[PDB]
Amino acid sequence: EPEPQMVLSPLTSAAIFLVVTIDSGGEDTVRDLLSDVASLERAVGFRAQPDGRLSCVTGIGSEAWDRLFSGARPAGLHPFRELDGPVHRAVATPGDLLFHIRASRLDLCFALATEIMGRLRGAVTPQDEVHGFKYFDERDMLGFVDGTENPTGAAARRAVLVGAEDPAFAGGSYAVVQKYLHDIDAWEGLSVEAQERVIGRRKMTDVELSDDVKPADSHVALTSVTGPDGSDLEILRDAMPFGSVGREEFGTYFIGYARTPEVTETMLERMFLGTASAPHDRILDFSTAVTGSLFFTPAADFLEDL
Amino acid sequence: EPEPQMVLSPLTSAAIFLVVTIDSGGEDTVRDLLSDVASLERAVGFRAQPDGRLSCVTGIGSEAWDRLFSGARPAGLHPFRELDGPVHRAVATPGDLLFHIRASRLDLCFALATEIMGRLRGAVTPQDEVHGFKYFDERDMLGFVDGTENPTGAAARRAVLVGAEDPAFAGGSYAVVQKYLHDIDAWEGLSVEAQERVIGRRKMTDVELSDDVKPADSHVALTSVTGPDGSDLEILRDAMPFGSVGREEFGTYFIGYARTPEVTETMLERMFLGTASAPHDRILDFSTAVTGSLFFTPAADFLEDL
Amino acid sequence: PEPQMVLSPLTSAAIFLVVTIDSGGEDTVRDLLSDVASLERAVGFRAQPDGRLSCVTGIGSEAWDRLFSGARPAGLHPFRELDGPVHRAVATPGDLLFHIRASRLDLCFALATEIMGRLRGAVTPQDEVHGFKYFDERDMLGFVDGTENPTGAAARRAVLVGAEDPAFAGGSYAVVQKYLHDIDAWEGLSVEAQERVIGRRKMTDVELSDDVKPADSHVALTSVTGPDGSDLEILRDAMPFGSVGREEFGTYFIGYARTPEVTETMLERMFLGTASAPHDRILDFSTAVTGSLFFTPAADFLEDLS
Amino acid sequence: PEPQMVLSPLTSAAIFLVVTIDSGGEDTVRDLLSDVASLERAVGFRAQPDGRLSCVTGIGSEAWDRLFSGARPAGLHPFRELDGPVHRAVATPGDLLFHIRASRLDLCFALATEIMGRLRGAVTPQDEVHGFKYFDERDMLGFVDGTENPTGAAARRAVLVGAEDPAFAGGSYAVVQKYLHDIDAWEGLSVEAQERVIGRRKMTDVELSDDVKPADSHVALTSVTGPDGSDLEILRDAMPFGSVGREEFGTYFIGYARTPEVTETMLERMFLGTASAPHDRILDFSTAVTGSLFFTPAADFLED
Amino acid sequence: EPEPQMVLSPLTSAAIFLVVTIDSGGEDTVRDLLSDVASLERAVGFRAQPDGRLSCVTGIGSEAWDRLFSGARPAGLHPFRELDGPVHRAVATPGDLLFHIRASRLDLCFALATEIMGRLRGAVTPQDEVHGFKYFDERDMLGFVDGTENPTGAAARRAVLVGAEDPAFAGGSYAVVQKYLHDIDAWEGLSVEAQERVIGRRKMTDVELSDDVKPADSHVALTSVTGPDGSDLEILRDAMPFGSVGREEFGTYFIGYARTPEVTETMLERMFLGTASAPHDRILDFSTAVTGSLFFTPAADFLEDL
Amino acid sequence: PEPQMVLSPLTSAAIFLVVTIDSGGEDTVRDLLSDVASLERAVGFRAQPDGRLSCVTGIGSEAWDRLFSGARPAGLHPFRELDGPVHRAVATPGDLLFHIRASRLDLCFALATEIMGRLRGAVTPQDEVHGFKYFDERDMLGFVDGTENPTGAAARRAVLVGAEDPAFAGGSYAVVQKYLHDIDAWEGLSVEAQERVIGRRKMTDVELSDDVKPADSHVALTSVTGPDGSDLEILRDAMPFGSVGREEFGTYFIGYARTPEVTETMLERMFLGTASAPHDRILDFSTAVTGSLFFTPAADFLEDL
Ligand code: HEM
Ligand code: HEM
Ligand code: HEM
Ligand code: HEM
Ligand code: HEM
């Protein structure tokens, strides 16, 4: 088989997201680093096992792929598609490489990011760097549990990993990232019952609203999608709180993994453009997107044979 | 009889340092928050006990003290003293209020900082915000164990807490903060043996160099000071690594607590001005101070009384 | 096919709930069964990774006939009462079993509260037991309990239905019995006499040699080989329970097997005896007061209902 | 003098046992009392450091007179029944209290088994409750419970008898009530309405400001100031309990104080009300079915 | 007030006991090491906190004291006295220095022992080296819980630390060590009931036998001693199992601390010489002493000043 | 076929036992082998989940012929002595290996006591070592030890016998060597000089680039490719041991492989050298004083006795 990267990681309380662009003539340095990234992960992580749980998932953008490699391309790889809805806009921002670094402690993430960027100095320019921390009861910046309905085990593998539909790229995945800033003053102006009608789940107990109370423009109603054959279309999320108390910056760094970008893109279209039944996802009246990029995360053996 | 704030904290792997100035007319809002800060600490921290270990130490600058309170001044409270050495400078920067927030996780520090700054918006301006993380083996940004010779138990109480010498302020302490950025490039150019001659201890095993081979301009030699009676003068440190790999910012946020500022200021004078035997502390040839402030951290009952 | 969480990691707390379905309660019950996996996620996700909450849901032979209109699992029948010369294994009513396990009683109790909230008016409670395991895996008799359970691949082969009943693959069969002990009589035996009842050493949990182990010891009678001389295995998670006021000291027995015939062969040898043994000596200090049999279907069977 | 483990670390499991002493049981009881600290060590030591097992032993007003001759602790009396306009605090029988706490129910149950084994034939059980805390210190009403308890030095001064009753120094007074909740009615309230009953925000556990806090909120009525304007404090370790089958959802209340006067002033305000408040709004969703008062002596009193 | 060595330690699962003699002319090397040993403890231990729990207690024999120091002798310090009972003998064996090294892991003990013996090679001759391990439920080599009736908190300090009776040595303690080998074959030939009559406690539940059943020659009866007034004389023990399965060596390395040696030596006289009511301690019919030594463990400041 | 616990989680304590079978001891040994998995559960289950106790049982080449009739595992032979120009890999006697691992020394000790209790009078001890790993996975030379071990499916492929020897599938081959270090000489090197001996950075455990890594560094010599250009890998769990009184500072080496040919190729390059290197520089600070080879069968092979 092909061996996947660590897309299906165990639960982690800390994360670093790094997005860079490749400077002109930086290609060779980048290909050198990509062949060594799993070795750097083992070197930083092994001495802190079994509790460290350090991993790095490496992603490549559509334009970067054409600069790095000749030949066949993953079937779904394109630049993030901007959405200009009647009220809300999903922006596309630059990004050639993604490092999704996760662990039980921020210091491990930071040590592996230091070795990665040390190897890339002179070849890349930083676009975004976020240090994520999860709240102790899995809560996000809106005060709701975040992760509950992710798929697990076999269902997760089927949802996230490329298989026989794109055989040359089997064991790969597609990652969409969006950094959101929240308007917390507006959000805290709602009662708890009004907040629940935005999300579609109870705040304190995390039980889903009944089919008879759940609004058509609630976040959970719009991100719930069935395919033609009536199967659930699922993604795997590992969204993380971040920000700065001084600048009054309260955010959610969103990442979703899927076997095809079509599933993630159908969810984003319903959220930003709406449906017959809903103008837009009510979560967006308290959340502004400031970045948007799409990456292909290849099989581990693809990176190792560079 | 008077109950100290949590100056003598158990070991914590995360910290937030917040330094603010009080805007004109902000005094009353500030006094109201100071009387509630212990209540806010319990509200965020109690539900995560016993492993959260959340604490907040609140400090007040010399000029802020005169705007907030009439009556007696703590005996040792003055503005941080700038040090103009022939090569190295210890700069003085503005700060009226210090919040030293510590816990076993960054998310708890961040939740308490959010409640504090929520009460003060409109009354203060942020000067510095740092999110610190400790390495898994108590290492700092230079790769040395950091904290080894701090005093513990009764020796720590004697070294840090004001007593009979200033009876109205007993159970208080004095906090000096400096943010340092390191030249990691220059530091990693040294052999391990050359790094040991800068610090004064072995890197991997943290054994002190013997009295005959320890250089006179090593960090350990210069911060070792005896009083007139031949007593060792000690401080309590809780320095934290911080940074951003994208902006190449690798730092140490220094905080030191002492029963009198004269002990910390004797250490800073030896480091920046030198002695007959040493021009300056060699650690300063790889470390630049960008902030400097001095605060009195009163007994908890002093803050509760307002 | 995705099993329910039959093969769970070690748990120190459990709630057993046995209920009968009132006339006309069927539709409410079918609605709850389609939601029970989502209720497990709602209560459990925010307490991960340490909570380790799971629920295994079972259906009795007569309830199956009232709920579902197609094929029956091949081994599902009402518990068979065993009328021995001395000891009786009684059959008591039960339509639905909830086997709820976690690292803490409060999590089991929160999931039981949500389940029973959905069933109020549709079911009548028959049994509710709150179990606790001793810190060194000991039971109410003071012996280590679980030692010879199968693990890994052997456990899956022993417990999960496969090719022999393909429509119900990934299911299992659960036998429950509540036992009350005569602890006064038990504690009147010497430790050596207790060892001859169980078949293992009390302090060190070493199996008695084939030369000393009596024919009517618990371990001799629950050791059974199939036609090829292969060991027939069950998976147990028996839990102590009781009340010191009422002098109630119990063991709540649950055993899981791929076919009821394995557990029923073990009960026949215990209660009816063999050529070599009148009955299991453990029964001279243990009285069964309940007995029921349940089919625990594959998770996808419960999810795909109406 | 060495106190019993009144000031315990946080515990997630508890057994409450209340018994009466049968006639002629006195000597069996006095034998167990001299050995109960030994039994605590016997069951607990092998499960350190995580077990955190302790047992606090209390004696009622009537029982004291049957067991001991000489001076009585100054504040020891039978629980006082409160007959309010709407809500009633009942007085129920109890001679001995065992407050058993640990990180796991199985350790509580092991110590309870050895204690009741020693007392079989001398005592009648009145109450047995097995308590569990929710993983974020929440109680049966879904609020954080314990937040304003005193800690360290403040806790010692609030809870332990000192120079005012020198023969009984290092003792405390324990008040217990078992409450059953109407959870149906409680879950019918909005979160905002629940906050106005308790006097704290539900999700973040921040006290309501003095301008929005209702006068008949639980926190407003259990706030009492002394002559010098000091806070009068108690130490609580109230525990959820119940049965899902029988629809029984409860809080087993225990409060410790250096004098019963502090706890009894709080109960009078809750049940009788004041000029400003009819009664504590928490009592429109909580019914007391037991009430008892115990003196918890110093460890050395029990030993000698 | 004087700072004790870490005599009152938290529970530790591993230990190294080192006993050495000072070679002729080794005195100055030894005095140099003694002034550094607390700094070596911090150097090895700090980076492994909070779980390491590493400490070292340093003791000095009666004859060594006279070679190392001029001035006052601690009032209770004398050579261990041999006990020649009718059946059992307590031997006295040489030792000038004791290192009692404890931690949560053997590797920490070993790293500190390596640094100590590195400083002394050429100055000392090793007499005994023992690597101790406690069983997971505090059980010893005889299978009984060991430590239960040790004093804690304030009672422990009163029992172990020298006070105003010998003011120059306040915060010191007296350590007696004996290495015992067990006859395991003979011991395991006893029933649990017979083992309980030797120890004086129930094996599984660690409940003390009643005054009416506890034999007069049981270990617990003979090591229970009351002073001239009425009160219990206590010592603090941290005895550890040790052995070699190859050599058939199964041992208990006994260490007891007391404020005066008279308490420990009264316990030894009752065990070896017996009373009116008992010939000897029944534990001695399964345990042979092969070493016996007495040390004074001074206050930490005594060692630091020299 | 259910393997023994070769692929164990990380363990901080170990006991290694090597014994020879006395005349007439065969029957006692066969009895103990059929019971050893049940003794592991008896000592370990009560201490789960933190105990992580396991025992791996191995049998030497000569012992196999005394214990069992029928087929021999294809790769089982006596350890081959290497007499290199400077350094020697010695062979020492061994019929049975017990590789006992846990999170605490006391659990290893309890299981070794029950095993040796069953064998008293049937076996003679050759070697007994009590191992301890440093808290940050460091070894006796002060380097992280384990970093490049294979994990998951790559580990199973590297260690477990498959279709090449079908009657012995789920078995493995263990090579043991006890090493004593000259720590005085080692600690006389600068950190930079030590890195050039190992082939990795000491503090950060980053591999030296192919351009700086010397040809006689330990990592260069124990890196081996097959005909197919694929890496040949082993699974190691080498453990520090010593006695501070005796000045004994050691590494007890154990390596597991699907075939002995992989471990034997690594030992030949270390002790005999290559075109580019006289010998492994790690051997100028490490002396081998034991050497033995064992087959560790599938668990069901031992049970069906
Ligand atoms: C870049 C900033 C700094 C770094 C990375 C740093 C790092 C260290 C390190 C590695 C040690 C040795 C281990 C220990 O005992 O903790 C140490 C010791 C110490 N440092 Fe610093 N230090 C810094 C700044 C300061 C400053 C500004 C002061 C005083 C104002 C200071 C006072 C001390 C003292 C008192 C010790 C203990 C000396 C002894 O062994 O007795 N440090 N520092
Ligand atoms: C009072 C109720 C029971 C108690 C207290 C109890 C206790 C025990 C104990 C202490 C063991 C030995 C350790 C171990 O788990 O391996 C054991 C083993 C066993 N018990 Fe029971 N048991 C009970 C009832 C039952 C019942 C009703 C069954 C089956 C229908 C059962 C089946 C087994 C089996 C299969 C084993 C393992 C046998 C082997 O070594 O292969 N037990 N039980
Ligand atoms: C159904 C029974 C009870 C429930 C569920 C309950 C629940 C709570 C809650 C959630 C708090 C707020 C957070 C905290 O400080 O813990 C609280 C505070 C408190 N309760 Fe209660 N309580 C009950 C009965 C009682 C009784 C009977 C008393 C006194 C006799 C009492 C005295 C207090 C005190 C003193 C406070 C703290 C007030 C302050 O902030 O100073 N409670 N209780
Ligand atoms: C191989 C040697 C020894 C073994 C295996 C051993 C074992 C134990 C055990 C199992 C207990 C009961 C549980 C407890 O409270 O710790 C105990 C108690 C005790 N042991 Fe020993 N012991 C040994 C030698 C000694 C020596 C040589 C002395 C005194 C010089 C001693 C003094 C004590 C004392 C003072 C107690 C506490 C008794 C009480 O007050 O209840 N032991 N020992
Ligand atoms: C004498 C004591 C020994 C010590 C102290 C030692 C130490 C080390 C250390 C520190 C590493 C680096 C980290 C790692 O990947 O584990 C390593 C790697 C390794 N050692 Fe050794 N080793 C020893 C003997 C041996 C022996 C006898 C063999 C083989 C027969 C061997 C084969 C290996 C292999 C295969 C690797 C991984 C190579 C790679 O990176 O691909 N070692 N050893």
Numbering used by the authors:
A (entry chain A), B (entry chain C), E (entry chain B): 7 to 312
C (entry chain F): 8 to 313
D (entry chain D): 8 to 311
F (entry chain E): 8 to 312
Lines quoted from the article behind this entry:
Using an X-ray free electron laser (XFEL), we have previously determined room-temperature (RT) serial femtosecond crystallography (SFX) structures of the ferric and Compound I redox states of DtpB,26 a B-type member of the dye-decolorizing peroxidase (DyP) family. Such an approach results in “pristine” DtpB structures that do not exhibit the effects of X-ray-generated radiation damage. The RT-SFX DtpB ferric and Compound I structures revealed that the distal heme pocket, which is composed of an Asp–Arg–Asn triad, was void of H2O molecules. DtpB, therefore, represents an exemplar of a His–heme-ligated peroxidase in which the distal heme pocket favors a dry site. By disrupting the distal heme pocket Asp–Asn–Arg triad in DtpB, our RT-SFX structures reveal that a wet site can be formed.
To assess whether disruption of the Asp–Arg–Asn triad in DtpB leads to a wet distal heme pocket, microcrystals of each variant in the Fe(III)–heme state were produced and subjected to RT-SFX crystallography using a high viscosity extruder sample delivery system at the SACLA XFEL beamline BL2 EH3. For all variants, well-defined electron density peaks were present in the distal heme pocket, consistent with the presence of resident H2O molecules. In the N245A variant, only one resident H2O is found, and in the R243A variant, four resident H2O molecules are observed, with three of these accommodated within the distal pocket and the fourth positioned in the space vacated by the Arg243 side chain. In the N245A variant, the single H-bonded distal pocket H2O molecule occupies the space left by the amino group of the Asn245 side chain but is positioned too far from Fe(III)–heme to initiate a bonding interaction. Thus, Fe(III)–heme in the N245A variant remains pentacoordinate, as in WT DtpB. Notably, the H-bonded Asp–H2O does not have the same spatial stereochemistry as found for the Asp–H2O unit in DtpA (an A-type DyP possessing a wet distal heme pocket that uses the Asp–H2O unit to facilitate Compound I formation). Thus, the Asp–H2O arrangement in the N245A variant would not be expected to facilitate proton movement in Compound I formation. The N245A variant can be considered to have a “semi-dry” pocket, in which case, the effect of pKa on Fe(III)–H2O2 would be less and is evident inFigure 2, with the pKa only partially visualized above pH 4.5. The pH dependence of the N245A variant is closer to that of WT, but the data provide evidence of an acidic pKa of < 4. Thus, the D152A and D152A/N245A variants (fully wet) are almost fully populated at 76 and 93%, respectively, while the “semi-dry” N245A variant is 52% populated.
